[PDB]
Amino acid sequence: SGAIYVGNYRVVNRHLATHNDWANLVWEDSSRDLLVSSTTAQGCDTIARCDCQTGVYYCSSRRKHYPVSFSKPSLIFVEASEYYPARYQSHLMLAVGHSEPGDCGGILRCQHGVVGIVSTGGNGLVGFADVRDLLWLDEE
Numbered sequence: 001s002g003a004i005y006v007g008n009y010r011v012v013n014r015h016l017a018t019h020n021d022w023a024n025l026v027w028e029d030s031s032r033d034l035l036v037s038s039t040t041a042q043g044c045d046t047i048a049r050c051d052c053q054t055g056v057y058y059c060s061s062r063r064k065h066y067p068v069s070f071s072k073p074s075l076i077f078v079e080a081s082e083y084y085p086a087r088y089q090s091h092l093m094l095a096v097g098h099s100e101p102g103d104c105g106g107i108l109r110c111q112h113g114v115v116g117i118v119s120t121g122g123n124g125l126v127g128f129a130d131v132r133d134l135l136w137l138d139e140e
């Protein structure tokens with residue numbers, strides 16, 4: 001589990017969104033595994049606006065933050081899950097790293113701020129849903 005709290009937005013994996021998230025929905029995109037809901041309190045996270053390919057992510061199944069090199073956001077194949085049919089997830093970045101399903105929501109960050117959240121993984125791969133192109137998270 002995990003979320004990004006930026007301004008009056010809460011960014012979570014769409015597959016982990018709560019009823020309160022759907023009842024206060026701002027935007028959602030199944031192809032990206034992302035959902036954004038509105039919050040009453042202002043958040044402290046800042047979004048990175050960059051093309052970094054190195055950063056650090058949080059892995060809840062190890063209680064550890066790991067430095068990783070990651071690919072550029074792309075259209076990748078993801079295995080069938082009870083959350084998604086096997087399919088093409090967009091804006092996804094891959095790195096070598098431990099992941100379990102519960103780890104989704106962990107933040108990946110670089111020197112500029114939050115880059116994305118754990119979204120996929122398996123066999124020593126971890127995938128991250130990028131949020132750096134969502135410029136509207138910084139306003140309104």
Ligand SMILES: NC(=O)C[C@@H]1CCCN(c2ncnc3ccccc23)C1
Binds near residue numbers: 084103123
């Ligand atoms: N965006 C998606 O397709 C959601 C899937 C749902 C099922 C779990 N998926 C995984 N995520 C992270 N780490 C993992 C480690 C081992 C196995 C699976 C995963 C993410």
Ligand SMILES: [Zn+2]
Binds near residue numbers: 048049111113
């Ligand atoms: Zn950066």
